[PDB]
Amino acid sequence: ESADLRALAKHLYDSYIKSFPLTKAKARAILTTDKSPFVIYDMNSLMMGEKEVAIRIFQGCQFRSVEAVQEITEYAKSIPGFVNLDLNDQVTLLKYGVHEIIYTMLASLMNKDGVLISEGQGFMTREFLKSLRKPFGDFMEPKFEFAVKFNALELDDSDLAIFIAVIILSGDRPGLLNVKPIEDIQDNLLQALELQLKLNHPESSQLFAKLLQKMTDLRQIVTEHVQLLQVIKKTETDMSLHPLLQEIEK
Numbered sequence: 001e002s003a004d005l006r007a008l009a010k011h012l013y014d015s016y017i018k019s020f021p022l023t024k025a026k027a028r029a030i031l032t033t034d035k036s037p038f039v040i041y042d043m044n045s046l047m048m049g050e051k052e053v054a055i056r057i058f059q060g061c062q063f064r065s066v067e068a069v070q071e072i073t074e075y076a077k078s079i080p081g082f083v084n085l086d087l088n089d090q091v092t093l094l095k096y097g098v099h100e101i102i103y104t105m106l107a108s109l110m111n112k113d114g115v116l117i118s119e120g121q122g123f124m125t126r127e128f129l130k131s132l133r134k135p136f137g138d139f140m141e142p143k144f145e146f147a148v149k150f151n152a153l154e155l156d157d158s159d160l161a162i163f164i165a166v167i168i169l170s171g172d173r174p175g176l177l178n179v180k181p182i183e184d185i186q187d188n189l190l191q192a193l194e195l196q197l198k199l200n201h202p203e204s205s206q207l208f209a210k211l212l213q214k215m216t217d218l219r220q221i222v223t224e225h226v227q228l229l230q231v232i233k234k235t236e237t238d239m240s241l242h243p244l245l246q247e248i249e250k
């Protein structure tokens with residue numbers, strides 16, 4: 001029954017709103033004047049924005065990634081069936097899905113010229129980020145490239161809540177014990193997302209299929225990021241990575 005798929009879409013949107021304090025809707029209202037962001041565009045304004053700069057920015061990003069992980073974890077528990085799965089598998093799903101979600105959600109805070117930071121209070125420009133040191137100057141560019149074309153789908157928060165749930169419940173992650181109950185949940189989530197996109201974007205042909213194709217882009221970004229992490233580890237032996245993030249990327 002489609003009525004059941006609507007109730008599922010509503011439950012997940014409700015949980016998403018409860019779990020993620022900075023939504024796409026809020027981000028778009030900031031980026032498009034009730035509270036305008038301070039703009040970090042150069043090495044000078046970063047001072048007034050308030051251990052070299054590149055590393056400082058990187059750790060800021062690290063810090064925000066761990067809060068995102070906390071937030072994503074909370075949302076995952078709201079996905080019906082998720083907490084009933086084998087504990088090891090829950091860990092497995094989160095481990096491999098978390099970065100994908102982060103990048104997906106990071107696009108909501110981005111436009112072609114930059115990205116919102118510190119809960120929307122700031123806006124760090126694209127050029128500034130790209131002119132960083134050596135190994136850091138190119139953490140954020142592939143992010144920006146994905147965001148530009150993901151943001152072209154014009155998904156709103158209610159779409160993204162279902163899509164993020166589809167991502168968590170894959171079933172093709174490495175080392176999963178009981179693949180079949182995961183796939184049974186993803187199958188229900190896929191059904192709800194399909195109905196959601198048809199109702200919310202009726203003019204937007206094959207949006208469902210176009211959204212699923214975007215999972216290839218997320219995979220490569222994660223891959224690329226992990227390589228950079230390995231580069232950073234060895235040329236910055238005096239810099240610490242956060243263990244929650246360090247555990248995640250095995």
Ligand SMILES: CN(CCOc1ccc(C[C@H](Nc2ccccc2C(=O)c2ccccc2)C(=O)O)cc1)c1ccccn1
Nearest residue numbers: 057059060061062063064065068106115116117118119120
């Ligand atoms: C708390 N803090 C940093 C201040 O807060 C910031 C933390 C990070 C940043 C850079 C920026 N990260 C964000 C920061 C705030 C809000 C959103 C983002 C997103 O870009 C984001 C979201 C998820 C994952 C990664 C990035 C970036 O990496 O593009 C700017 C500011 C520190 C860091 C070191 C020492 C002391 N105090």
